[PDB]
Each structure stands twice: as structure tokens, then as C-alpha cells.
Design a protein around this ligand. Structure first.
Ligand SMILES: [C]C(=O)[N][C]1[C](O[C]2O[C]([C][O])[C]([O])[C]([O])[C]2[O])[C]([O])[C]([C][O])O2[C]1O2[C][C]([N])C([O])=O
Ligand SMILES: [C]C(=O)[N][C]1[C](O[C]2O[C]([C][O])[C]([O])[C]([O])[C]2[O])[C]([O])[C]([C][O])O2[C]1O2[C][C]([N])C([O])=O
Ligand SMILES: [C]C(=O)[N][C]1[C](O[C]2O[C]([C][O])[C]([O])[C]([O])[C]2[O])[C]([O])[C]([C][O])O2[C]1O2[C][C]([N])C([O])=O
Ligand SMILES: [C]C(=O)[N][C]1[C](O[C]2O[C]([C][O])[C]([O])[C]([O])[C]2[O])[C]([O])[C]([C][O])O2[C]1O2[C][C]([N])C([O])=O
Lengths: 142, 142, 142, 142
């Protein structure tokens, strides 16, 4: 069993990103999302699955999906931004298992990732615990 | 724009179901989940989409996915229980747009629905506001 | 250090009680409230303090404060209902340390308590773990 | 009826502040705290009361209480940090109605305020909507 505990840091009081969706991919006996002491906790039944969090800033028409999981017994992450209305977390989470551009991100098994949207706002995931069954990450909204 | 505001009632102190997942289908400009004044609020960009909530009772190894949406300008709902580990809300939400028996449930445009798991516990959805753009439902756990 | 983990069971879809306030009394090095896996977790720095949760049903003009704590190394609980607008949880929590009718409830060190409001709705606290540092209780709204 | 809607910004991945307490003062028919679309919403029955939020970073042994209210029909705010274990939000909220220095902070009717703890970290409140019945503020953690 794996857990990834995520601390969300929203660093800029221009716009406001709120949580809107949390998904579990179906491999590795699935998984769950829990809120624990102000943190998001993704629990997974084995290696080879993932879960996604979508955040939306309605004030500024910005959004992103942050995905966390374990691939071949190593943690991975990705961020997708500049979303169309059709790119829910349900959509994006599932794309990591069959869409080549997404598969490759997962296969990279990254301990950290940062991306900017069209407006220049940066978003980052940084794992603070990178090994073992109980992983930890900061999700940083610039 | 539709909202469906959901109040959860857990009616017996036998087992404890906790929220674990909330998904948005991609049709009709997608949608979001918000927590508002103790209720789960599904917001959708128009008619023809839906969102799902999964709840798990780890104490009693029970779970269910409740789905809410609007089909041809009328609200609908369904519950799936007896879930396999591969049946996350991500999976179940999508099945209402391709799987005949699930398609049929959506097409039923029900204001209320119930189903029991193999353990004999019943779950129900009851829309208390069945018309207009701000719909309301009780999710009742037996 | 003591914890009391509380599972809220809202059993009747007549009215809707939502969480509106959570307080910590100042004795025994204070305490905190956390949300953990859908449960409310009161953590206290020693014996002799408590914390309160207030719930309000705006639909039906009903409300109550449920207080949990440890007195002389034994758990206690109380429920106050039929609240005036001036009886916030901040008010009620503090009354257990100087108001005789409230002091006596605390001194009773109850493992369970049930009360009805003027409308006849029952509210109950039942501790499911009654000894040790990590206590557990159901809060049942009738 | 006033609402004050609060957005929390945690600006540095150094430490992690989590919500631990939310209180309502008893004047002006009291008030409530709700979570709405990722924001903390304080609702008050009129002018002359307030509510407090406490946040704790156990990682770095830091904490603060942020208080928001309306005094003589104008919004006010304060932050207290360098908290003792006996300074819960329950305690601090009440001090604004009897303790001269706290009374004075309320009487200041500030649209913005900041204070630093002994560790050099600054906290701020910034009202983004300063007039009317639906007030809005940023709570910024430095
Ligand atoms: C171990 C790992 O991690 N692996 C992975 C996977 O996962 C899996 O899946 C399956 C189905 O297919 C099941 O669910 C199980 O349980 C699990 O584990 C997957 O995810 C993939 C993607 O798709 O990846 C990984 O792997 C690699 C290769 N391809 C193989 O297969 O092996
Ligand atoms: C109106 C309605 O409801 N409709 C519906 C739909 O939705 C839709 O979808 C599309 C794509 O495909 C888009 O997204 C839009 O926007 C929306 O609106 C769908 O859902 C379906 C299922 O699949 O159902 C309904 O419809 C029916 C038929 N198809 C016709 O149209 O009519
Ligand atoms: C041990 C116990 O539990 N005790 C109690 C108390 O608590 C206390 O308090 C103090 C102040 O005063 C401090 O804070 C400490 O820390 C603690 O512990 C109290 O609470 C009381 C009520 O008021 O009760 C109990 O006790 C009994 C008697 N009175 C004595 O004092 O001992
Ligand atoms: C209008 C206003 O804001 N006022 C104020 C007050 O509040 C009040 O209180 C009372 C009792 O005491 C009752 O609760 C009512 O309802 C309310 O409104 C108070 O808070 C104070 C502080 O202590 O402050 C203000 O005022 C001032 C003076 N005292 C005169 O009046 O003016």
C-alpha cells in the first residue's frame, strides 16, 4: 500500500484556485482520496496507479490538474494546465494510461515538476519524501 | 448552468462511510464539485453531463458510487454498489456514456433511486428539488 | 496527549444540520480540531480540557453544541440544545468551567449522553472507545 | 446579516499551517462559520460581533489567531501570534470585548493588518471588498 500526502501552497493573492475534483485510476486495486490534517492523502493499493486533483481559479479563468502516483515502484507526478472545459480530472487521470504524451510523463518517475500556463503563472509539485510506502509532496501554486 | 446540492445522511451507526472521490464528466462544458455549507455541490455547464461521489466504509468493507446529472433537461441519478476495487468513481461516471444498462439508468431521469449491496444495506438518492437550475438531493445511507 | 475521534451520523432527512463552529478550551495546554478521514479529531495536551462542536439546521431552526473532553483522566461529554443566538460554542465550551449546571455534566464523566430538543428530536453521544489516550465516539443526530 | 469570505494563502513551502479552530462571538445574534467553495465564510447576525480562526504549523511550532468582524458598521480585523498553549481562538476571540489593547484593535476598523511572530514570519489580513454586507478578505501567511 502506498500513500502520497500533499500540502497545497497557494502563494499569490492574485486569483484564487479552489479544489473541484479528485479522481482515482483503477489499476493496482484502485485508491482513495482523504483529507487529513489539512492535507490531501492519496492511498493506493499497489504500484501502477495514480490519482488527480483539479483546481480552478474562476476569477482569472485559470485551472490545472495535478496527478500523483507510483509507476514501477517509483513515485511520479505531472501537471497539466491551459485546460479546455472537456479536460476534467476524470479525463486527464485516465490519459496517463494510453495517451503517449501522458504515458511518457508517468514513465519519467519525477520527484519534481514545474510548468507555466499561457498567462505565465507557474505551478509545481515537489516531493519532500521520495522513497518508501509513504510519500510526501508540496503542491505549489505560483 | 445547473447545480445539484447534495446532503448526506448516514442513518445507522453501523459502519462508517467516508468520502473518497468526486469526478466530473466531460460533456456540456464539464463541471465542478464544491463543498458548500456542509453539502456537496455539483455544478455543470449545461444539460447532458454528470458527476459522481464515491463513499467507502473500511470498517465493513462496503462502498458505493452515487451519480447525479441532467439528461435532456431533466435530472437523473444512479447508485452502483458491490464495487470491485477497479470500480472507482472515475470508471463508473464514464459508464453512463456508453454502457447500455448505465445509459438506461441515466435515460430514466429518476427523481429517486435505491439499491442494496450483497450485505443487505440499502442506499438511496431523493431529489427534494426536482425542477429548475438549482436542484437538491438527499443521499441516504441505510 | 488525548485524542477523541468523532463520527457524525445524521440519521433523519428532515432538516439538515451543518457544522458551524469548533472550539478549544484553554486548560491542559489547550487542544486542536482536525478533520481526518471524514471524522472530527479533538487532540488535547492533557487531562482537564475539552472542545465543542456546534451544528445548525437552518431549515428547521434547530441547533446544538456537543462537547467532548477528559476530566480527571476519564472522558466526558454533554449536549446542549434549544440554543439562543447568544449561545455559540465559544460560550458553551467555556461554561463547563465555572457554571455549576455545566460543571456537573463534566464531572459525570459520561461514556454516553442523549437529550431531546423542544421539537422532540433526539441527539446522542456514544463513546465506542472509553479508555486510553485515543478515544472514539459517535455523534448521532436523530 | 454580514458575511466575511476568507481566502487563505500560504506563500512559502516552509512549514505548514493547518486550520485547528473556528469560533463565534455572542453579540449581534452570534454567527456561524461555513466552508464555501474553498473559502472560510463567517456569517454574523448584525454589526458588533466577530469570529476567529486559529492555524497551527506543528512542523515549525508556529501559530496565529486571525479575527474578523464588524464594529459600528465597519469591518475590522486583527491577528495575534506568539501564542501560548492557553491562547486558543476561544480565548482570543473574547478578548476583543474587554481587553483594552484588543478593544482598540477592533475599534481601529482596519481594512488590512499585519504582525510578525518571534521567528520573523509575517501574517496579514487584506480585505478585498471593504464595504457592503458581503465582505471579502485574503489571509496571507508569509
Ligand atoms: C508494477 C507497476 O507499477 N506496473 C505498472 C502497471 O500497473 C499494473 O497494471 C495492471 C493492469 O494493467 C494491474 O492493475 C496491476 O495491479 C498494476 O500493478 C501499469 O500501470 C502500467 C501502465 O499501464 O505500467 C506499470 O507497468 C509497466 C509495464 N507496462 C508492465 O505492464 O509491467
Ligand atoms: C441536451 C442533452 O442533455 N443532451 C445529452 C448529451 O449531452 C451533450 O453531449 C454533447 C457531446 O456528445 C456535448 O457535450 C453537449 O454539450 C451536451 O449537451 C449527451 O450526454 C447524451 C449522452 O451521450 O445524451 C443527451 O443527449 C441525447 C442524444 N444524444 C440527443 O442529443 O438528443
Ligand atoms: C487532571 C485534571 O483533569 N484536572 C482537571 C482540571 O484540568 C487542569 O486545569 C488547570 C487549570 O486550572 C490546568 O490547565 C491543568 O493543565 C489541567 O490539567 C480542571 O479542568 C478542572 C475543572 O476546572 O477539573 C479537573 O480538576 C479537578 C479539580 N478541580 C482539580 O483542580 O484538581
Ligand atoms: C452597532 C455595533 O457594532 N455596536 C457594537 C456592539 O455590538 C452590539 O453589542 C450588543 C451587546 O453588548 C448586542 O449584542 C448588539 O446586538 C450588538 O450589535 C458591541 O460589540 C461593542 C463592543 O463591546 O461595540 C460596538 O458598540 C460600541 C458601543 N458599545 C456603542 O454602542 O456604540
Amino acid at each position: 500500500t502506498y500513500t502520497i500526502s500533499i500540502r497545497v501552497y497557494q502563494t499569490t493573492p492574485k486569483g484564487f484556485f479552489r479544489p473541484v475534483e479528485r479522481t482515482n485510476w483503477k489499476y493496482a486495486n484502485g485508491g482513495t482520496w482523504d483529507e487529513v490534517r489539512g492535507e490531501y492523502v492519496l492511498t493506493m493499493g499497489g504500484s501502477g496507479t495514480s490519482g488527480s486533483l483539479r483546481f480552478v481559479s474562476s476569477d482569472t479563468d485559470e485551472s490545472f490538474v495535478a496527478t500523483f502516483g507510483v509507476h514501477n515502484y517509483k513515485r511520479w507526478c505531472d501537471i497539466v494546465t491551459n485546460l479546455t472545459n472537456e479536460q476534467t480530472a476524470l479525463v486527464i487521470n485516465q490519459e496517463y494510461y494510453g495517451v503517449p504524451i501522458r504515458d511518457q510523463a508517468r514513465e519519467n518517475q519525477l520527484t519534481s515538476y514545474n510548468v507555466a500556463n499561457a498567462k505565465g503563472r507557474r505551478f509545481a509539485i515537489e516531493y519532500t519524501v521520495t522513497e518508501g510506502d509513504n510519500l510526501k509532496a508540496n503542491l505549489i501554486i505560483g
